[PDB]
């Protein structure tokens, strides 16, 4: 039933007595469902130390992973260049998924094509699909550039991207000077951050490999910035703002900030802004190249050190105070510009915030996950705050990264109770937050399922989710946030101390029971 003045959607509609009664009959009659008694006992068992031991013996099964595959990163990379169409050579199912995935995170259109390789293209190869596809795409959507990556099936069968594209050009499907950079992006290797590294390297090699002869390092007086797989619009914007503020000439290579934030003004723009082809061609002339997220830009770094001959600085991701400081001094060192009074003041305003909030953050325990550089940046900042990371999970992490993060942890009194996990998923993490309960989780939307689980055990075991990372599908416009630099650090500090205060108020909102500590002033 519906009262026309107050229509109910699925919640709370299905709580009406007639639906509830109907669902009771469904279950009893046809579901052959395990008794509630058993379900509760099984549930309780999965929260124990013994279930954790079994759970951590897994060797073949993955449950709720915290990563996606390579071409997702390639697509994001390709999106960052002017009038560029991401083009994924292989099965079209993948593209439908990549677009949907980014649509939901960005609440924006996401442009990308497939060349629709079917069963006969599986056994004969995708040479024809690549010919017809490059021609059709150029004609219909008119990009300046098409950036080609691969699905897993094109990789199993070894479709030679370089040859397929050269024959397309040789046979007149697209003009020879029409730029078609490529990168093999196999999904069964690494993860989506690895796909970003691979795609960027293809494009950079495409524009600079032939013509190294006339390049002189330092001759355009600018600093190359490579951001890596990045999904906070504010992150592109803050790097650009701090460099402009210092007077540093800079060149952001892969810049999707504009095209992922177009205005609603009556027209759809498939393309907007981004790194130009001329900027890439000119990149080897820069003073140096800074990699924002080095732990997934290793292939890019070898090409840039080897072919461009830049002394790429050893910098951590510029998150939190020390590493933002370190980033700014090194940009200062490369370019000759001193650090302006305006950035120095901003630094002291983040310090002021740390001093103001330290009593509430101190000793607070967090479980967290995400991509390698993000996680280590977030871990470093939690330590600078007097917080205790407890469970650090990075599913797409490696042994060397794990070694670096264990060193940061051990350098501080606040890391004594923390352990780093690589190769482990969100079902592992779920066990950890039941057996060794932290105060909060910091991760993406997928963590809401953990929070629901911890709550089902009991309100005193509930571990709230703090949404920082990618993808965030169940809040709106968090993709406009910042995590880098001083600006990112202020936002994170504010998100953290206020999650802490929001939770405390909930635990103290009980009339004449807990509200003696329901303070007006915190």
């Amino acid at each position: 039933s519906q009262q026309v003045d107050k229509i109910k959607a699925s919640y709370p509609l299905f709580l009406d007595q007639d639906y509830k009664d109907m669902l009771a009959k469904k279950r009893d009659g046809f579901e052959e469902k395990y008794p509630q008694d058993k379900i509760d006992e099984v549930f309780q068992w999965t929260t124990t130390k013994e279930y954790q031991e079994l759970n951590f013996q897994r060797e073949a099964l993955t449950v709720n992973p915290a990563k996606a595959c390579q071409p997702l990163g390639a697509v994001l990379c390709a999106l960052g260049f002017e009038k560029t169409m991401p083009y994924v050579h292989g099965s079209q199912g993948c593209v439908a998924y990549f677009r949907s995935y980014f649509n939901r995170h960005f609440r924006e259109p996401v442009s990308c094509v497939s060349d629709s390789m079917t069963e006969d293209a599986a056994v004969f190869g995708g040479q024809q699909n690549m010919k017809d596809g490059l021609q059709n795409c150029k004609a219909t959507y008119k990009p300046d550039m098409i950036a080609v990556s691969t699905t897993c099936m094109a990789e199993v069968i070894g479709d030679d991207l370089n040859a397929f594209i050269n024959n397309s050009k040789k046979e007149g499907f697209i003009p020879d000077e029409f730029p078609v950079p490529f990168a093999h992006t196999p999904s069964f290797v690494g993860s989506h951050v690895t796909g970003w590294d691979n795609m960027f390297e293809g494009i950079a090699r495409y524009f600079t490999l032939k013509s190294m002869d006339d390049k002189v390092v330092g001759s355009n007086k600018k600093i190359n910035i490579v951001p890596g797989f990045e999904t906070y619009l504010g992150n592109f914007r803050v790097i650009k703002r701090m460099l402009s503020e210092m007077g540093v000439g800079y060149s952001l290579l892969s810049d999707p900030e504009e095209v992922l934030d177009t205005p609603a003004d009556g027209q759809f723009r498939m393309y907007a802004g981004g790194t130009t082809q001329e900027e890439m061609k000119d990149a080897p002339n820069a003073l140096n190249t800074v990699l924002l997220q080095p732990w997934h830009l290793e292939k890019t770094k070898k090409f840039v050190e080897g072919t461009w001959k830049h002394e790429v600085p050893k910098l951590n991701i510029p998150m939190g105070l020390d590493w933002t400081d370190e980033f700014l001094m090194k940009v200062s060192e490369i370019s000759g510009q001193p650090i302006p009074a305006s950035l120095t003041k901003e630094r002291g305003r983040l310090v002021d915030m740390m001093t103001d909030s330290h009593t509430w953050l101190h000793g607070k325990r967090f479980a967290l996950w995400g991509d390698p550089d993000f996680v280590m940046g977030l871990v470093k900042f939690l330590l600078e705050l007097g917080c205790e990371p407890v469970h650090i999970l990075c599913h797409n992490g490696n042994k060397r990264w794990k070694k670096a993060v264990d060193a940061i942890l051990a350098a501080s009194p606040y890391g004594k109770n923390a352990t780093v996990y690589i190769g482990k998923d969100l079902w592992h993490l779920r066990s950890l937050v039941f057996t060794d309960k932290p105060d909060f989780m910091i991760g993406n939307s997928y963590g809401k399922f953990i929070q629901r689980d911890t709550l089902h055990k009991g309100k005193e075991f509930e571990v709230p989710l703090i949404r920082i990372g990618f993808p965030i599908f169940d809040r709106h416009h968090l993709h406009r946030s910042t995590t880098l630099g001083y600006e990112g650090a202020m936002q994170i500090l504010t998100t953290l101390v206020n999650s802490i205060l929001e939770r405390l108020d909930e635990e103290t909102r009980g009339m004449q029971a807990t509200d003696y500590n329901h303070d007006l002033v915190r």
Binding site: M22, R27, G29, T62, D132, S187, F449
Partner: protein, 476 residues
């Protein structure tokens, strides 16, 4: 107009290379409600032209995302690399009642997460080991499906063997599904491979069993995936009408409901496209008749209730007329409130394989007109059903391209578009009101009398929103 629309078709097609032009021309038509053989006017279910930004998915999405995934007390393994399973995790809102991770698993992502060694040496050993860990960590699971992603089908892993061997060792139904993404041309073949697997590995488990107590009023709901609770909202009407719903395929579905479906008297098929396969098979093997119904809006629902009740005795027909009399004042008030706000409005639709024709009824009940519609992956028998439901000189498109759909809308200028998440943000930026017609924009149900109320409210809130008058800056 008929000639004007034909002209619009020829102009749009001018941008394509000749091969893509000759083909895309076969998939765009000007409707004739008089025509009953759609082959004459349009062709569908062909492979997409490369590089044209089709909105179509793959066989795996069709099988795992759509048919298998909703079955709540089985564990569905995304077999292969980590991507597929991760982009589809809790993306489709197939609602279910259960204790997730204990006796129910719908929102979870299970995968074998192929690395390079698993590609080169094959993954049957890992798959076997994977099933042992599952049975350890989720002992209340009532069965397991193995949903092959692209590379499982290339390298020739023997998942049927692993399923017979491990299933015997554990006395567990394990269903191997070859829903390799490169098979077919879209989601559609995945439905089919999903239905044949239900048939081959589950539907017959109780062929010899006669313990289940059957009545002349037993029916199954086939082809409702309970988006936002659509099926729960349908089920209540059927039962108030005195029918007993033994099964729901596959929204809120259990593996035991599926095994008990052969004991019903009539199969109620909502989504024809995705489950007409198993319905024909159940008629051939068990003698069970099946019929298509539509619970979108009051007119279609009222007509469907009467048609279904006519398959039984006069008692059920009496109860039919009761249910109708009960919800009559409720759907009439919805009409009185929302139709004056929607009358005369024009909508263009683009969805998968059922809704582009199925929901036309609900729009008309609010005084709206469907000026254009098309499918991602229907077959010609869907377009046979479609053309009498559309008005004359309306536009029909199949596997429409991002470009084509963009340009059609520029000329036709509808007040509302109802399509998917990939379409959404393109058309909002154009100042055109947009409703998601797969996910229902996280709202719904829209099925039945209770859904129609949410349906009316959603179409009006969006179309008549104050944000749509704000797109131009006053100064330009």
């Amino acid at each position: 107009s008929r000639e004007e629309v034909e002209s619009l078709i020829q102009e749009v097609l001018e941008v394509y290379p000749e091969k893509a032009r000759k083909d895309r021309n076969k998939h765009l038509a000007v409707n004739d409600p008089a025509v009953t053989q759609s082959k004459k006017c349009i062709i569908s279910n062909k492979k997409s032209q490369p590089g044209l930004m089709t909105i179509r998915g793959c066989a795996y999405a069709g099988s795992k995302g759509v048919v298998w995934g909703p079955i709540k007390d089985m564990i569905h393994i995304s077999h292969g690399p980590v991507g597929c399973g991760q982009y589809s995790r809790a993306g489709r809102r197939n609602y279910y009642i259960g204790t997730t991770g204990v006796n129910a698993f719908v929102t979870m992502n299970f995968t074998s997460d192929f690395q390079e060694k698993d590609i080169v040496f094959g993954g049957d050993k890992k798959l076997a080991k994977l099933i042992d860990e599952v049975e350890t960590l989720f002992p209340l699971n009532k069965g397991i499906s193995v949903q092959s992603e692209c590379p499982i089908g290339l390298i020739g892993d023997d998942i049927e063997s692993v399923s017979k061997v491990k299933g015997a060792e554990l006395s567990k139904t394990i269903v191997p599904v070859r829903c390799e993404g490169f098979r077919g041309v879209s989601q559609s073949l995945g439905h089919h491979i999903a239905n044949d697997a239900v048939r081959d590995w589950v539907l017959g488990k109780r062929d010899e069993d006669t313990t289940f107590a059957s009545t002349p009023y037993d029916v199954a709901i086939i082809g409702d995936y309970n988006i936002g609770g659509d099926a729960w909202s349908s089920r209540i009407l059927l039962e108030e009408m005195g029918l007993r719903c033994v099964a729901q395929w596959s929204g809120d579905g259990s593996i035991s409901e599926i095994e008990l479906t052969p004991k019903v008297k009539l199969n109620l098929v909502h989504c024809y496209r995705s489950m007409n396969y198993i319905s024909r098979h159940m008629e051939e093997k068990y003698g069970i008749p099946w019929m298509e119904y539509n619970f979108f809006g009051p007119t279609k629902t009222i007509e469907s209730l009467r048609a279904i009740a006519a398959k039984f005795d006069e008692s059920i027909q009496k109860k039919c007329e009761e249910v109708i009399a009960k919800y009559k004042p409720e759907w009439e008030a919805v009409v009185a409130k929302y139709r004056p706000r929607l009358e005369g409005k024009r909508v263009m639709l683009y969805i998968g394989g059922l809704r582009p024709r199925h929901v036309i009824g609900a729009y008309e009940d609010l005084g709206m007109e469907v000026v254009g519609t098309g499918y991602e992956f229907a077959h010609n028998d869907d377009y046979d059903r479609t053309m009498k439901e559309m008005g004359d000189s309306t536009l029909l498109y199949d596997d429409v391209t991002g470009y084509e759909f963009e340009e059609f809308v520029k000329r036709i200028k509808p007040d509302l578009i109802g399509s998917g998440i990939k379409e959404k943000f393109i058309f909002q930026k154009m100042g055109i009101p947009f409703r998601q017609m797969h996910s229902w924009d996280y709202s719904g149900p829209y099925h039945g009398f209770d859904g129609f109320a949410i349906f009316a409210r959603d179409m009006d809130m969006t179309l008549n929103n104050p944000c749509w008058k704000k797109l131009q800056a006053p100064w330009e």
